[PDB]
Amino acid sequence: GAGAGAQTVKPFKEGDRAVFLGNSITDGGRYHSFIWLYYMTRFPNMPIRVFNGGIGGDTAYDMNKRLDGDIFSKNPTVLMVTFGMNDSGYYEYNGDNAKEFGEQKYQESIKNFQQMEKRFKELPHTRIVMTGTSPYDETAQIKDNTVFKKKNETIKRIIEYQRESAARNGWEFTDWNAPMVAINQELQQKDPSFTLCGNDRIHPDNDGHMVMAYLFLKAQGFAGKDVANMEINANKKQAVKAEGCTISNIKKIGKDISFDYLAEALPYPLDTIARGWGSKKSQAEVIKEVPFMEEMNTELLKVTGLKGQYKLLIDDQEIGTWDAADLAKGINLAAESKTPQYQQALTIMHLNEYRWELERTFREYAWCQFGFFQQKGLLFANDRKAIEVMDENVEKNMWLKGRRDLYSKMMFKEIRDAREQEMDVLISKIYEINKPVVRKIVLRKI
Numbered sequence: 001g002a003g004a005g006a007q008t009v010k011p012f013k014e015g016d017r018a019v020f021l022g023n024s025i026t027d028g029g030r031y032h033s034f035i036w037l038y039y040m041t042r043f044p045n046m047p048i049r050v051f052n053g054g055i056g057g058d059t060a061y062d063m064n065k066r067l068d069g070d071i072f073s074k075n076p077t078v079l080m081v082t083f084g085m086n087d088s089g090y091y092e093y094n095g096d097n098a099k100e101f102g103e104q105k106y107q108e109s110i111k112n113f114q115q116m117e118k119r120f121k122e123l124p125h126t127r128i129v130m131t132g133t134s135p136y137d138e139t140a141q142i143k144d145n146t147v148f149k150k151k152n153e154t155i156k157r158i159i160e161y162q163r164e165s166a167a168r169n170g171w172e173f174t175d176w177n178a179p180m181v182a183i184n185q186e187l188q189q190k191d192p193s194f195t196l197c198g199n200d201r202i203h204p205d206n207d208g209h210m211v212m213a214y215l216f217l218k219a220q221g222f223a224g225k226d227v228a229n230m231e232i233n234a235n236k237k238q239a240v241k242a243e244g245c246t247i248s249n250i251k252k253i254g255k256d257i258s259f260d261y262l263a264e265a266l267p268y269p270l271d272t273i274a275r276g277w278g279s280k281k282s283q284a285e286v287i288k289e290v291p292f293m294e295e296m297n298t299e300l301l302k303v304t305g306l307k308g309q310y311k312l313l314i315d316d317q318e319i320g321t322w323d324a325a326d327l328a329k330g331i332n333l334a335a336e337s338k339t340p341q342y343q344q345a346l347t348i349m350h351l352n353e354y355r356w357e358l359e360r361t362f363r364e365y366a367w368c369q370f371g372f373f374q375q376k377g378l379l380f381a382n383d384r385k386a387i388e389v390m391d392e393n394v395e396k397n398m399w400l401k402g403r404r405d406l407y408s409k410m411m412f413k414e415i416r417d418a419r420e421q422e423m424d425v426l427i428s429k430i431y432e433i434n435k436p437v438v439r440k441i442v443l444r445k446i
Contacts, residue, residue, distance in 0.1 A: 001295030003223020009129055009172045011220040012039060012048045012078060019051040019076035021063055023086055025134055025203060026054025027363050028276075033356040034213035034283065038296075040352065041266040041345050042227070044434035049427075051076070052359050055367050059087045060112035066370040067119055069379060078127040081116070082176075084109065084158040085133055085202060093148040102154045110161045117165055130166040132159035132175035134204055134212055137184050140195035147201070152181070174219035176212055183211065183289060196289065199278060206275060207285035214292050227299035227334055228263045234305020241302070255306060255445040261314075263436040267334035268297040269345035271353070293335060302330035303443060310443040315340045321446065340439055348430050355426040358419055364403055365410035372400050382411040 012018050020032040036050040051074050055062065060083050063071075071079070087109035092101040120128045136152040159177050166173040180196050187194040195201065196208040204212065217223070231241035232250060234257050239247035249260040270284040286292045301312075307324040312331075319338045322331060333339055337346075372393070373379050378386045387408075394401040409415055 001224030001291065001298075003218045003295060004221055004225070006218050006223055007221030008174050009216070009219045010127070011222070014046045014048070016048045016077045017051065017075060018048065018078040018080065019053045019071060019074050020080045020082070020131075021071055022054040022080075022082045022133070023058045023063075024054065024056030025085060026052060026082065027056045027058075027367075028054070028360070029204065029209045029212075030206060030283070030356060031204075031209040031212035031216070033352060034210050035216055037349060037352050038213065038217055038222070038268060040348055040430050040434055041268055042222075044265065044431070044436070047431050052356075052363055055363065055370065057086060057371065059083065060109050060116060062370065064112055064115045064119070065374065066366070067116065070366055070370060072119075072123075076126050078129060079120070079123075080129045080131045081120075081162075082131045082133045083113070084155045085136065087112075087158060088136070088151050088154040090148050090151065093151050094146070098150065102150065106154050106157050109158050113158075113161065113165070117169070120171075121169060128166075128169070128171040130162040130171055130173045131216070132162060132173075132177045134176040134197065134208065135181050135184070137181075137195045137197040137201040139184060140188055140197070140201060141192035142195065142199070142201065143193075145200060152177070174216060176215055179215055180208075180211065187289060199280070205279055205281045206271065206283045207281040207289060210270075210283045210286035210292070211290055214286060214290050214296065217296060223295040225296070227265055227267050227297065228261075229298075229300045229302075230261065231302040231304065231330075232257070232259060234303060240304070255308075256443060257303065257305070258440065258442045261439045261441050263299070263341065263439075266345040266348070266434060266436055267299050267339070267342050269342065269349040270297075271349060275353070293332060297334040298332055299334040299341075300330045301333050301441070302328065304328040306445075308445050310445050312336075313442040313444060315440050316442075327443070341436060344433065344436075348434055351426050351430050355423050355430075358423045358426070361406065361410065361419065362416075364406050365416070368400070368403055368407045368410075372397070382413070386411065 020026050032050050032052055039048050053071050063083060087105060089101060089105045133155060136155060138147050138152050156177055159175060163173050184196055196204055196211055198205045198208060226244060228245040229241055229243035230239060230245055230247055233240050237250045237252060244264050246262040247259055251258050272282045272284040274280050274282050309321060309323050311321050312319040317338060317340060319336050369379055373386060376389050378389060390400060390404060394404055
């Protein structure tokens with residue numbers, strides 16, 4: 001893989017609380033969940049906590065309003081900050097005063113960001129990471145979806161202001177906008193309708209969020225690092241290579257060879273389901289858009305020794321059949337969904353998705369609090385006057401009416417406690433079952 005030198009953001013370490021502050025891309029998306037999934041499977045003995053701090057519709061103004069009650073309240077040790085998709089504006093780019101509109105939106109955005117910047121400079125023990133938002137895809141050919149011309153240029157201006165602020169203040173910086181635009185160009189060559197940025201050029205689908213996770217992990221220096229790399233010479237019966245693992249009990253019976261494999265990490269599991277209303281591409285689609293398998297999901301098994309065709313079994317489960325030329329080349333166990341460790345990784349992936357859904361309900365509650373109740377002087381009131389004002393407003397506020405049932409549940413402290421306890425149930429299960437166990441690998445010749 002091609003990274004390690006690509007590191008601009010320090011990796012998370014044991015006990016970190018990494019909060020991803022953002023807008024709807026963060027709020028309703030999974031890139032942060034996919035990043036946590038990486039840390040859960042690759043560093044199973046290094047527990048961390050990731051927090052979704054996105055609220056749909058936010059600009060730098062809204063993010064700044066809610067820093068105390070929604071972001072700093074989570075006590076981040078590492079805080080990622082992304083914005084601009086809403087700040088940049090939309091329809092007026094195709095109107096008469098596009099240039100002046102872009103300039104006014106850029107100025108308003110950095111004015112609000114400066115309020116946030118001042119707050120970040122005052123934090124005593126929080127690593128600040130400016131993360132340039134994913135782009136508005138201006139070049140994709142989407143049916144019946146009209147392009148807001150040059151909107152991503154205002155976005156890029158905001159991201160440059162972020163970069164230079166990070167330089168001044170001693171903060172780290174990484175950018176999704178440029179690499180994702182580049183990938184958009186590259187795959188739009190193959191199909192003009194391809195995009196990392198979803199059906200509306202704005203909100204990435206699961207594949208886009210997995211690319212975003214990939215890029216953030218590469219910025220943390222994980223690109224090019226293998227899940228495990230083992231090389232067994234069949235005629236010598238010792239392991240030539242045992243990177244990220246322990247090889248032992250190499251045995252030869254007739255022309256079959258078997259050994260014990262104890263990995264330090266599990267493979268990265270990829271969801272193949274297009275999850276979400278209107279979703280069309282899965283997390284797994286990431287493999288066709290970036291070198292994800294090669295740079296970050298390589299669990300390489302190389303057996304140089306006798307030749308012919310062999311059947312690979314792990315813990316007595318048939319994985320597939322390969323010629324020993326392929327085996328001597330090396331095969332990627334992380335692409336073989338039938339391995340027991342991949343099934344274990346998938347278990348963790350499903351637990352993590354359940355957790356992500358619970359967290360989203362907390363994000364809906366946060367919208368109720370900062371997108372409605374704060375302006376009514378009722379932030380965190382969670383009382384009868386809160387109920388009264390919400391009732392007075394639901395007939396003229398479609399979004400608030402859609403969340404009244406959820407708010408009637410989540411306004412109770414005891415329910416927020418119980419649902420947090422549920423998230424902790426899932427997180428504890430993940431960090432209980434994510435330890436690789438000794439796996440019995442067999443190459444049976446056919």
